[PDB]
Amino acid sequence: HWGYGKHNGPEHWHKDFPIAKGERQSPVDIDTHTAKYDPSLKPLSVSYDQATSLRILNNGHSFQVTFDDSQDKAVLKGGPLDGTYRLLQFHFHWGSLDGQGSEHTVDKKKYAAELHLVHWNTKYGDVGKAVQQPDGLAVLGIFLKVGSAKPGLQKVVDVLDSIKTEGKSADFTNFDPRGLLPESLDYWTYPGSLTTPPLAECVTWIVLKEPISVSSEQVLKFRKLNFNGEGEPEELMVDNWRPAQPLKNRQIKASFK
């Protein structure tokens, strides 16, 4: 049903998913001057050395690279988190033009795209259970700006023509997500939600201050993907981002001064 078009997009989502108008929805604008430096925040622990990628998939609203989350291989911990979070998948949100595409914004600034590394809290056993918990998920968000290419992304971009339409998937093993991380792990963090339906309010957001640079040719290949399945009228998978939602009674904390 739901999508990013005029008739089924973000402004329509609340009808099937009333939590869309809830108290901790995502994404949000990160007002850098209002974010509070919290020296009690531990450093982020990103442990991806044993990551096992499995498949890459066009799911009708994004493309995602899925990982084996049946043991504590690639895990996120520390920072604002209590406990261990298993990497399940990563995916992107991007625009039709370089000046839009990100879901979070920084002082109202939009980036060309945003990378989401989705992790779930091992204390809840499976991701289905985790999405029902206020601290079930931790999503690492990384901004993409257009400039120099990101060499680590290229293996991803090169198989996108094999998953053009909704439903298509491919073997995608031995991909190293460390190749997608910026130098600094400085971050903002706040309690939020999934940014697609069901918009469940189960996410601790960890958004990195430092964007990665990707080339125009790389993001252009994102934009050749299709929302539609094969045999349906071609609608380009572009502008698959939800806009900033009301901050309401939340504080964004920064891990850095």
Ligand SMILES: COC(=O)[C@@H]1C[C@@H](OS(N)(=O)=O)CN1S(=O)(=O)[C@@H]1O[C@@H](CO)[C@@H](O)[C@@H](O)[C@H]1O
């Ligand atoms: C493309 O990713 C997904 O389909 C959803 C949305 C995306 O939310 S966001 N954009 O805030 O990172 C995350 N996942 S998800 O909710 O963790 C989605 O959840 C579970 C369903 O309950 C699992 O089947 C996972 O495969 C997971 O992808």
Ligand SMILES: [Zn+2]
């Ligand atoms: Zn996302």
